[PDB]
Amino acid sequence: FQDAYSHCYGLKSYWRGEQTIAHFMPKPFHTAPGFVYGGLIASLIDCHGTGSASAAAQRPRFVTAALNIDYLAPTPMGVELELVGEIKEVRKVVVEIALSALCARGHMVAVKMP
Amino acid sequence: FQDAYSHCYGLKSYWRGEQTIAHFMPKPFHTAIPGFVYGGLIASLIDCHGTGSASAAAQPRFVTAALNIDYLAPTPMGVELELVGEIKEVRKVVVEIALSALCARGHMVAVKMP
Numbered sequence: 001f002q003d004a005y006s007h008c009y010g011l012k013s014y015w016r017g018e019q020t021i022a023h024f025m026p027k028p029f030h031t032a033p034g035f036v037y038g039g040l041i042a043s044l045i046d047c048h049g050t051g052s053a054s055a056a057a058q059r060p061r062f063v064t065a066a067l068n069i070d071y072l073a074p075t076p077m078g079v080e081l082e083l084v085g086e087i088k089e090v091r092k093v094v095v096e097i098a099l100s101a102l103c104a105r106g107h108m109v110a111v112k113m114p
Numbered sequence: 115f116q117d118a119y120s121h122c123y124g125l126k127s128y129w130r131g132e133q134t135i136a137h138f139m140p141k142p143f144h145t146a147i148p149g150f151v152y153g154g155l156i157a158s159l160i161d162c163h164g165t166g167s168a169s170a171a172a173q174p175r176f177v178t179a180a181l182n183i184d185y186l187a188p189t190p191m192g193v194e195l196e197l198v199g200e201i202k203e204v205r206k207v208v209v210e211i212a213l214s215a216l217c218a219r220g221h222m223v224a225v226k227m228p
């Protein structure tokens with residue numbers, strides 16, 4: 001995962017079956033008061049999806065080509081965020097990322113890093 | 115306009131005629147891989163510029179409902195980033211944002227903060 005592969009803002013992602021997972025705790029300044037900065041959420045969805053992508057091809061370096069995020073609901077501060085990832089297609093993976101506290105959904109195209 | 119309205123990561127955005135515009139300087143640690151800029155940070159700056167752009171155009175607090183982003187090229191580190199917004203339609207603005215050093219095209223649907 002990010003420990004098997006280095007100088008980014010990449011969170012630990014893991015396998016939970018065919019799906020992947022991450023957990024994150026926003027520091028108090030990571031605000032939007034009482035709510036989580038919407039750009040962090042994209043930061044986390046983005047590194048998880050790329051990580052998820054690396055795993056799937058492993059079963060290799062990947063980069064985001066496209067990232068689409070629906071913000072479904074305000075994300076409360078002071079709560080652990082959990083990220084779930086679904087592999088929809090496997091040099092390029094397609095991943096669906098769900099972030100809960102559901103607050104935000106991502107559809108992500110990762111390709112092999114050129 | 116963020117000095118017009120406070121505890122986010124919102125960047126100084128301004129009118130550029132009919133377009134809006136902003137500039138940003140990544141900190142040395144905001145890397146992706148060496149030599150380039152973290153994608154989360156890039157997605158973060160489109161979001162706050164796009165929302166900033168939204169509030170000015172409607173004139174009010176706006177939030178992102180959807181943000182779609184295509185990563186057109188790697189973003190070099192140590193150079194000032196320029197963000198320009200296109201207002202595509204105006205309690206809901208649709209905005210097109212371009213970050214340069216063109217490195218990424220973002221599409222935003224912003225709605226009034228509920």
